[PDB]
Write a protein that binds this ligand. Structure first.
Ligand SMILES: Nc1ncnc2c1ncn2[C@@H]1O[C@H](COP(=O)(O)OP(=O)(O)OP(=O)(O)O)[C@@H](O)[C@H]1O
Ligand SMILES: Nc1ncnc2c1ncn2[C@@H]1O[C@H](COP(=O)(O)OP(=O)(O)OP(=O)(O)O)[C@@H](O)[C@H]1O
Ligand SMILES: Nc1ncnc2c1ncn2[C@@H]1O[C@H](COP(=O)(O)OP(=O)(O)O)[C@@H](O)[C@H]1O
Ligand SMILES: [Mg+2]
Ligand SMILES: [Mg+2]
Ligand SMILES: [Mg+2]
Lengths: 485, 472, 55, 485, 236, 121
């Protein structure tokens, strides 16, 4: 009798100890008489611990409980494109049922060691500071760690917007579909975000998964995992996907809540022992597949929220260890006028130049190393002592390179527009220009090439590299413009 | 037949009720107990099992005897809603506490209700002029948006709000709902005086605002529900009436503070810092209800308390994410004598964009930040060496910076009894031009003192001239 | 003569610097206590919370 | 064996006792054991009850008899307590015979509602100039006295009591202000000598003393503030004015965290329980100004908090500051430089001062508080030795004169009429010309000049309490003439 | 009611004391500085002086006393004359070895206190109670309360710390019959005075006789430092 | 020579925790101090009557970044009769053995040092 059903013994705080259910599986979905569904996480002889996806004011002692017989899964396929679903994969935008092609589980095994490929495919983020210093690669997971109100989401958001350059195209192997995963955010914000995507015709290749704070803790916990399965889909069918988690810091808080309430002993700061295993079996799910598998791939941009700039924290360290580098963002640099406030000193990419564009690779070789020297000289000129020709020369250029990296939000720049700017920087053609001039210089120089030397922009774009001839013309195009005005 | 039960345990603000009948009341329901003093209201929290339930007292549990009879209400704590609540002081329970007779309202909705659907969410980018320099210039508030006023103890969170009510509630045109959660009972009374004198609340006439109080003197159960009571009233005018409403809350922190006192007795495993595991959710369900929908707009000014001046504290740290505008007060600034002690650096808003406040406004603001920032980054040097060691360029930025900081201060009409200086209301238009003029270096001759507690930019030059005659 | 005036000022400059920097040490040294005690009490709370685990 | 009004002790330890029985007992009801020790049913469980011990657990044996009182813990309240020293229970400890109480009040009273109240408007002369000028106290205000060890925290509360003698010996009642000192966690000698000083100044006649020594059990120190509160609440309801001073509340919380930890309660910040706020909250709220319908009575409270290393950012301190209507911090540094009382104008605050301050002081002292606030900023900024301009230097000279003028010896209370003149001169600048080492002698010599000459001005400010447009001129010509000589 | 209503100075016998940091009759004095400053020499002194001026006996109490030092102390005391086997001794010794369990450690102090109170209420003498060191007394409690299961307070110390301290300091006072002056050493944990143990101890201390190395270095005996030595009875 | 007591405490802590005994500072039971105090006090100098025999103890404690303020070290340092503090920094300079003269102290001192060397030390 009780094999497929059970009576509730206690209920509260989204937890429900039901009695019976001696044939239910681990992590299996269930349904109460009230209509509200739940998830079984603790299997014990006496009772079964279940977590509620909705309010608990509806469940009461002695209520009937039924099982689903299936592990919590979510609808997947192209249909979701442009739609906004919740943890479970149900539509929340109000635009009809989700037309899915298949259904995959929440928890999926990470791709094999055999079916992998070294990351070689770039991920144009449109951010010069990024594509030049810490390039992204199809199949890696680049962290975006920083304090509140710095510009973490910004970096991610602009990326999706930049993809419009190829998603409107015909070629598939070049496009890059985007999966935003809002977790812990308020519905107000999510609404405004999705509004902004549409204002840029970026919603058509974008899938959004909402797990606002108001929803139940188990939703916020499951949100990322289900969302990942959504993206994995493209990876398997030989397409490219780009998922953004924002943010795992909240997810751990959520997952911490189920543990404590299920009366599971806490580790450090109340987080469950396996809190690491929470993000490890998530990020590893994204990687570059073998040619046999489809040459498919899934890129990940995890987001973390530090307190007081303390990266030595419990959760952040757990994730820094997994991610293929991190884009550290400091509040202090933001006010100084460095926007986006990317600290090069601490931001790195483990894939490195392999992922970066070949063209942009040439124009900026030791650029990151040079910016390191700049901060070295910038700190030493604090003494208030005169500087020779060497220490002032690099100080002049290093100060302007930092000003060239500043780029406005919602303004992704193609590759053909980044190369030229960086070119004139690393060489030293901006040294002879005032700092408050670098601003308009960028826009003016671009308009110059798009009008006159447009042929070059077309070669850099297609070729993606720099030939002996292309450098010659590019060289002369730069000097000619400096002379102007 | 009324459902009845007996008490089995009484620990603090937590009473365990048991029902002989096989029908148990759901969660979030109310209960009442007969006493010589009146009636004690209970609220279901969780079903411990064995036809026993755990509930949270709404008032003192002194005198409660084990096995005493308990009557069921049949519905979650409800409170009267409608224009009938205006000009009346409602209690956490939903009963008049101003001694002016019962609130004859038409309908009575429960304090517990689910947050607006994602599709119902409506976003807006309209600016809201307050008159406050440090705000309308740096982090302007938005119409029907969420406002937050963080800060330690005695930094200026209430006094800041009082001014907002003296400048917006008057020229508003809609309705207002003030709810004092865990605050000095005295401030409530004096607040009542102000509403009467200003005429916002006329006993004989009509009123424009409703007063709901769950002061700190009240036990934890109340300090936990009061916020919900006040909110239910305001969401009525939002959907039912579909009219602009100003929701003033102070202080919102008490909401989680009051819940962390009982979480222990409820049998929950304390999370780090002592706060209950479900901090994120509870705080979530509250903020998600306080928002603008497609039926009406609501501007909320919530004040948040900062324990031990720690912004990393889980309580306030989970509040920022639920705000479209954040104005943090650092006691390190108030002690300087600068008021309001707004910290330009930490302060953020969503309206700080050139596509809204204008290109010039964006540039002027940014310049102010950079200047203030450069002063902070050299602060270490100043205490050690001094300005003598500062470079020519750096030394000029400091003075200018120090001028901008002092200029940020603004005399408050509400705080005139503290500063002894008549209030000063400055328009956004003049404020921008003002700082912009200071950036251009058109006032580097005027002494810094002339920027301290000054209203309009004209008043600076005026005050500078007055100091010439005082010099002997 | 103007050299004897630099040494004289520089002897005053570094005198106050040692006094400010010195006195600054007696201020941060207090913050090192409250922060030391905080870490000792916090690490202790997790140890107690892990043992107070019952049913 | 009546398991309805009496029960048996099941176990004892850690200052808690689990008795079996007492089915008709009220929550928080006083009780007594076979040994005669009084307890309190702090919690009620099915099958057992928790009782706190107000005495040593040595006297409580397992298996004894336990009778109930039938009434919640209460303390004798009335006018007969005046001049008498009692403990937390209300029993005499001085040995002058039993207390003449008019009635008995609960130990735990609820604060007056919002309607039966009025804003404070009755000045409360403390005798201290720097106090009743920057942060004055009014009948019904809650002024905090925060400061480090040996900084003069009680020295400000003590002098206030001795200054009340000027009205307590009068015929009128609304002018008299009863005093109720509360000593908790202090030494025997410390309190005994404190009482002696009151008798020497003949101030014990209008003062009530409540004792909660450290030797006494923690709970006594816990209930001492609450009971002592009810003693003064009596005067309030009768239309009289009372003044209670807690010294100190910071120790209480420590005593309470004891019972808090013993009863196994999840530790919070600094090992204080989460309900530590409701402790001082419920206590302070019971101090305000009632409406005229109630009796126009009031109860001014002066809580005291001891910090460490001048840390007002601590937990306990901030919790109190978020309740009291202003603080009077006492920095140690200023205390050693001679500047006594070491009132730090920077952190000192009065949320309802001007409202309850003499208009004679409001006029002569304008923007004096803010000036001093900015004073320390420019003063501590020019202490490097660097040269400044005339603007900053001018404010630096006037600041120093005011700072020295705020100074005052202990046991030397000055009438408001005597304070008004001193402030006037400071703001105007007449003191600026005066030498810094002559500021002290000048004050004692200036007062004699008015009494010997312009006595009429003193008598006018006394009664009227406000400076008219005419008296303002007569005063100026009288000070200016003295500054010249 | 048995408490006094006035604090009086207790003539010790040292100028550096009576003039700078005088001892309060029935008060608590803090002695800083370890071996090398002749701490032991400064202790036996107060025992002799008071024995000749006030004729009151003394009681030495050692909490977690090093068995090594305990030996050399006893022996030294026989060489100075504060303790004579054949004649008449002036001070009673009550040591509590470190190799003893917390239970005993946390009671050593009370043991020595009892003996001292006897000569206060019976013979009514100005007896001096020496405790070295008040710090291990708090540590003792901390280990005891630890094993009992009681939850640890701030910094790890016991919650009951506040009450315990008083169940020892309060008992040391001047009554109408006699008086007991406490001369107990103090140890500052990690050179931090914010810590509970020290914080709580100082709350009872009335005077402090510091012993600096730099003072004995100048050939100044005792090594009492005039600048650091302060008293709460230094007023007109 | 006990090399090292630090490791011993860790072992003992393990047993104590597994046995579910009350955890103290840093997860060390209250009897941890009673452990070392009941060990070091065993070594001493017997009198002439006892046999004039003697047992010297050189306990070794490993600090974590110079933190002598830690629990275990504070216990040991309080019981012993002197320390031979060693710093890695002094080691790098060349000063080997890197014995910080400033901190290294001995309460017995000359009492146990050859007069031949005391006259020049
Ligand atoms: N590139 C940029 N240039 C100028 N301002 C920016 C830029 N990127 C972001 N901002 C500003 O920073 C503010 C917050 O940015 P963002 O949303 O990126 O922070 P966040 O990391 O998402 O913080 P949270 O996680 O709390 O949302 C916005 O108001 C935005 O105007
Ligand atoms: N205005 C003053 N001028 C000179 N001395 C003062 C003044 N005020 C206080 N003192 C001295 O400071 C000493 C310390 O006593 P006081 O009670 O003022 O400190 P406290 O901080 O209140 O101590 P506690 O808080 O422990 O009671 C007093 O004995 C008194 O002589
Ligand atoms: N605009 C202001 N100008 C000057 N002082 C202010 C201002 N706002 C707040 N304050 C100071 O704060 C005190 C009152 O504190 P309050 O603002 O109520 O703090 P809280 O935020 O804790 O309620 C007043 O004494 C006042 O000096
Ligand atoms: Mg974000
Ligand atoms: Mg407030
Ligand atoms: Mg005091």
């Amino acid at each position: 009798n009780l094999n497929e059903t059970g009576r509730v013994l206690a209920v509260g705080d989204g937890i429900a100890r039901v009695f019976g259910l001696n044939n239910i599986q681990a992590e299996e979905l269930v349904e109460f008489s009230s209509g509200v569904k739940g998830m079984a996480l603790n299997l014990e002889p006496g009772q079964v611990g279940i977590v509620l996806f909705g309010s608990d004011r509806l469940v009461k002692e002695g209520e009937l409980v039924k099982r689903t017989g299936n592990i919590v899964d979510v609808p997947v396929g192209p249909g979701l494109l442009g739609r906004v679903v919740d943890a479970l994969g149900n539509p929340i935008d109000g635009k009809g049922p989700i037309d899915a092609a298949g259904r995959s589980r929440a928890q999926v095994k990470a791709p094999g060691i055999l079916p992998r490929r070294s990351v070689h495919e770039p991920v144009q983020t449109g951010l010069k500071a990024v594509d030049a210093l810490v390039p992204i690669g199809r199949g890696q997971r680049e962290l975006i760690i920083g304090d509140r109100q710095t510009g973490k989401t910004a970096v991610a958001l602009d990326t999706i917007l930049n993809q419009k350059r190829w998603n409107n195209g015909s070629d598939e192997s070049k496009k890059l579909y985007c999966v935003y995963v809002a977790v812990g955010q308020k519905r107000s914000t999510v609404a405004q975000l999705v509004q902004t995507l549409e204002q840029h015709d970026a919603m058509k290749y974008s899938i959004i998964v909402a797990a606002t704070a108001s929803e139940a803790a188990p939703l916020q916990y499951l949100a990322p995992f289900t969302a990942a399965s959504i993206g994995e889909w493209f990876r398997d069918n030989g397409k490219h996907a780009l998922i953004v988690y924002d943010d795992l810091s909240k997810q751990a808080v959520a997952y911490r809540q189920l543990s404590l309430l299920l009366r599971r002993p806490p580790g450090r700061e109340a987080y469950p022992g396996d809190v690491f295993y929470l993000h490890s079996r998530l990020l590893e799910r994204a990687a570059k597949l073998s040619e046999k598998e489809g040459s498919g791939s899934l890129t990940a941009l995890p987001v973390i929220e530090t307190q007081g700039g303390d990266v030595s924290a419990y959760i952040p360290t757990n994730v820094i260890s997994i991610t293929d580098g991190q884009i550290f963002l400091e509040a202090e640099l933001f006010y100084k006028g460095i926007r986006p406030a990317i600290n090069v000193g601490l931001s790195v990419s483990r894939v490195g130049s392999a992922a970066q564009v070949k063209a942009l690779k040439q124009v900026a070789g030791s650029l990151k190393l040079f910016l390191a020297q700049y901060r070295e000289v910038a700190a030493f000129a604090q003494f208030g002592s005169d500087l020779d020709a060497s220490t002032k020369q690099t100080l002049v250029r290093g100060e302007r390179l930092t000003q060239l990296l500043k780029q406005n939000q919602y303004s992704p720049l193609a590759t053909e527009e980044q190369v030229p700017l960086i070119y004139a920087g690393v060489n030293g053609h901006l040294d002879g220009i005032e700092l408050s001039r670098i601003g308009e210089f960028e826009s003016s120089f671009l308009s110059y090439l798009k009008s006159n030397h447009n042929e070059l922009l077309t070669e850099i774009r297609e070729k993606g590299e720099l030939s002996k001839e292309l450098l010659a013309s590019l060289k002369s195009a730069t000097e000619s413009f400096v002379a102007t005005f | 037949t009324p459902i009845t039960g007996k008490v089995t345990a009484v620990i603090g603000a937590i009473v365990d009720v048991h029902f002989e009948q096989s029908e148990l009341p759901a969660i979030l329901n109310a209960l009442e107990i007969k006493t010589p003093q009146g009636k004690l209201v209970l609220e279901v929290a969780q079903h411990l099992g064995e036809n026993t339930v755990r509930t949270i007292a709404m008032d003192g549990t002194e005198g409660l005897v084990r096995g005493e009879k308990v009557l069921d209400t049949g519905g979650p704590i409800s409170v009267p809603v409608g224009r009938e609540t205006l000009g009346r002081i409602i209690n956490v329970i939903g009963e008049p506490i101003d001694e002016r007779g019962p609130i004859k309202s038409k309908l009575r909705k429960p304090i517990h209700a689910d947050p607006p659907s994602f599709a119902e969410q409506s976003t807006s980018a309209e600016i809201l002029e307050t008159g406050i320099k440090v705000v309308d210039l740096l982090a302007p508030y938005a119409r029907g948006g969420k406002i937050g006023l963080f800060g330690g103890a005695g930094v200026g969170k209430t006094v800041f709000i009082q001014e907002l009510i003296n400048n917006i509630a008057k020229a508003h045109g809609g309705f207002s709902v003030f709810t004092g959660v865990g605050e000095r009972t005295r401030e409530g009374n004096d607040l009542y005086r102000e509403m009467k004198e200003t005429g916002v609340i006329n006993l004989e006439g009509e009123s424009k605002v409703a007063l709901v109080f769950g002061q700190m003197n009240e036990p934890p159960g109340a300090r936990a529900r009061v916020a919900l009571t006040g909110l239910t009233i305001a969401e009525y005018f939002r959907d039912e009436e579909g009219q602009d409403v100003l929701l003033f809350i102070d202080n919102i922190f008490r909401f989680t503070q009051a819940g962390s006192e009982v979480s222990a007795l409820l049998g929950r495993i304390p999370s780090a810092v002592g706060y209950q595991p479900t901090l994120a959710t509870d705080m979530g369900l509250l903020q998600e209800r306080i928002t603008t929908t497609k039926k009406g707009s609501v501007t909320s000014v919530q004040a948040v308390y900062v324990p031990a001046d720690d912004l990393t504290d889980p309580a306030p740290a989970t509040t920022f994410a639920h705000l479209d505008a954040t104005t943090v007060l650092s006691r390190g600034i108030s002690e300087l004598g600068i008021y309001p002690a707004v910290d330009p650096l930490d302060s953020k808003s969503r309206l700080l964009d050139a596509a809204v406040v204008g290109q010039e406004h964006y540039d002027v603001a940014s310049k102010v930040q950079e200047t203030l920032q450069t002063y902070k980054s050299l602060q270490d040097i100043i205490a050690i060496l001094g300005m003598d060691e500062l470079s020519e360029q750096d030394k000029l930025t400091v003075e200018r910076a120090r001028k901008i900081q002092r200029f940020l201060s603004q005399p408050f009409a509400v705080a005139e009894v503290f500063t002894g200086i008549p209030g000063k209301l400055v328009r956004l238009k003049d404020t921008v031009a003002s700082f912009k003029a200071v950036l251009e270096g058109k006032y580097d001759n005027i002494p810094e003192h002339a920027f301290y507690m000054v209203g309009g930019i004209e008043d600076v030059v005026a005050k500078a001239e007055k100091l010439a005659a005082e010099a002997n | 003569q103007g050299y004897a005036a630099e040494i004289s000022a520089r002897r005053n400059a570094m005198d106050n610097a040692s006094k400010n920097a010195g006195d600054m040490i007696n201020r941060y040294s207090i913050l090192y206590n409250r922060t030391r005690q905080a870490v000792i009490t916090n690490e202790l709370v997790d140890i107690i919370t892990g043992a107070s685990s019952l049913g």
